[PDB]
Amino acid sequence: MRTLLIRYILWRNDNDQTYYNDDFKKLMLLDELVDDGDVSTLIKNMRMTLSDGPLLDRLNQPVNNIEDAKYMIAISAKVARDIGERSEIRWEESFTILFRMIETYFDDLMIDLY
Amino acid sequence: MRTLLIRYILWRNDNDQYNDDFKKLMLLDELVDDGDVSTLIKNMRMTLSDGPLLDRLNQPVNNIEDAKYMIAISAKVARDIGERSEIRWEESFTILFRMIETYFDDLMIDLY
């Protein structure tokens, strides 16, 4: 699940068809869980501060259920999409936090998605 | 370069499936002796951890050739450890990129 998620988020950032996988379609359905106004706000702040800081702060918030985890995947995905490929983000730091929160739900997320 | 490298190492581990980019990166494999990888894999298995890999990656990088080796050692370990291996790859990337980040520009030039 770790690999698939790293791959999906990076793909959401550059949208390189060379690195596309069919398991991304199911993950993309989680986008409905995130309001675009929240993303707009988050992106604006990232740009305001010239950092991944605001993203990392959002990812550092508690995950108490699978729906919380699904949201975190989707917020990462939409931020990755909207921030642009030129964006010099140390993605591994975001993955560190994301997986620290969602890791436990991997098995159940695998079930819920496939 | 960060993205390409994350993609290459993960691909080396398990085959997602193809571009020219990975071909150039694969040429760096000659820099790493397979006996060193065999040893590293053996230790990882002995300890049931990425610990030995992380220890290798935490060693100093003083030139581009040092950086090229680190990419290749990561690649061959990724290959030889197997897909089933529950490795927190992001921790390896954290250390790898902490060492090699400065060389990204020159590595981009040297490879393409």
Residue numbers in the entry:
A (entry chain C): 1 to 114
B (entry chain D): 1 to 17, 20 to 114
What is written in the article reporting this PDB entry?
VACV protein N1 is an intracellular virulence factor that is expressed early during infection and modulates innate immunity by at least two strategies: preventing apoptosis and inhibiting NF-κB activation. N1 is a Bcl-2-like protein that contains a surface groove similar to those in cellular anti-apoptotic Bcl-2 proteins that bind the BH3 motif of pro-apoptotic Bcl-2 members.
By analogy with VACV proteins A52 and B14, which have the surface groove filled by bulky amino acid residues and do not inhibit apoptosis, we introduced the bulky residue tyrosine at positions R58, Q61 and R71 in an attempt to ‘fill’ the N1 groove and thereby exclude BH3-peptide binding. To determine if the point mutations introduced in N1 generated unanticipated structural changes, R58Y, Q61Y and R71Y N1 were expressed in bacteria, purified to homogeneity and their structures determined at 3.0–3.1 Å resolution. While WT N1 and the groove-filling mutants (R58Y, Q61Y, R71Y) were all dimeric, the I6E mutant was almost exclusively monomeric. Interestingly, groove mutant R71Y which retains the ability to prevent STS-mediated apoptosis, associated with Bad. Consistent with this, WT N1 and mutant I6E and R71Y all retain an open surface groove, bind Bid and Bad, and inhibit apoptosis. However, infection with vN1.R58Y or vN1.R71Y induced lesions that were indistinguishable from vN1.WT.
